[PDB]
Amino acid sequence: YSYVERTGDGVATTFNFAFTGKGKGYLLANQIYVERWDGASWQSATGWSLSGTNQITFLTPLANGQVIRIRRIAGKDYPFAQFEPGVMLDMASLNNTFIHLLEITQELLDGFYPDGFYLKQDLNMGWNKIVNLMPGTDGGHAVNKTQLDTLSSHVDDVDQKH
Amino acid sequence: MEVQGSLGRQIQGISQQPASVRLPGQCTDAINCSMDVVEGTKSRPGTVHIARLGDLGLIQDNTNIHHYRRGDDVEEYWMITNPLGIPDIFDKQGRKCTVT
Amino acid sequence: KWEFYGATIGGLYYSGETLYLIIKRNDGVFLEAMYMGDPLLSGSDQVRMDRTVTVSLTWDEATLSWKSSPLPWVPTQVEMLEAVLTNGDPAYLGGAFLFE
DSSP: OOOEEEOOOSSOOEEOOOOSSSTTOOSSGGGEEEEEEOSSOEEEOOSEEEOSSSOEEESSOOOTTOEEEEEEOOOSSSOSOOOOTTOOOOHHHHHHHHHHHHHHHHHHHTTOOOSSOOOSSOOOOOSOOOOSOOOOSSTTSOOOHHHHHHHHHHHHHHHHHO | OOOOOOOOOOOSOOOOSOSTTOOSSOOSOOOSOOEETTTEEOOOOOEEEEEEEEOGGGOOTTOEEEEEEETTTTEEEEEEEOSSSOOEEEOTTOOBOOOO | OOOOTTOEEEEEEEETTEEEEEEEETTEEEEEEEOTTOOOOSSSSOOOOSSOOOOOEEEETTTTEEEEOOOSSOOSOTTTOOEEOOSSOTTTTTOEEOOO
């Protein structure tokens, strides 16, 4: 959909990306944003530039094993085009407004969320599962069965000593 | 009663007279209206910028502006006379004319 | 009555087919001609516009927008004016548009 996972490492300095939609798939150049993963967390990339309508080129080759993603972020507070009395409607703004409104919905369909996002009310799981979660760091974090398994095994180890 | 009436065409010109028996159709206030028999009440025709004459000091409340025409719609000259000075002359296209 | 924003009229000079106006605008004194016989030179409808100049629009790939020739005069009010297309796509002919 909106995001593209790209693993380009060694020698290569340019990468090509395709987005769901019409043509280049983005409203403006500033929508494109690059993220680099350092093995622990994601952070903004540096030195990247927009080569053309599609595909971007880096100033230096990426290090071996480097992984980056190309995302499409659009303004959420404001509509793309605002209309005024006694002006003419053009097809660019009319089609783009639907495209923008369709685009922002698609971003939530990829799991992307803005910073400072927290739920206000409790959510019902409705008899489902939680998957692929690391063991927590602080007491406020959640727990996977791996921590429970280790605690149970540690309990068993002392019980055998008992 | 449930009655409806008409005001007719509004081509008579503004009237300061009170509405009580004023006239059928008067348009008490009209601004920028090319007000003609066939077209009813349109808007005034626009203006076309052709040239610039000079600065703000050219025209004063005392300034004379004289216009005259020569020949078959080819020569038109505007003479402008500021106080305490020789008159200035401009052509159709706004180009200044030399005066000796 | 007719009105103009911040304008002093030196005089009206009705010459043949045209009406020539000398006006004292904010940025200088200009000569303006009124085609008050409202001829439809081109387009579906006439243009109602105070002071008219024909400009050219050229595409600009630096910012993906249209750029225009410099405006010969200083407008009185920025928000008051508007631009009207006169030669372009057949569908958009004779219609205004938004601009910066």
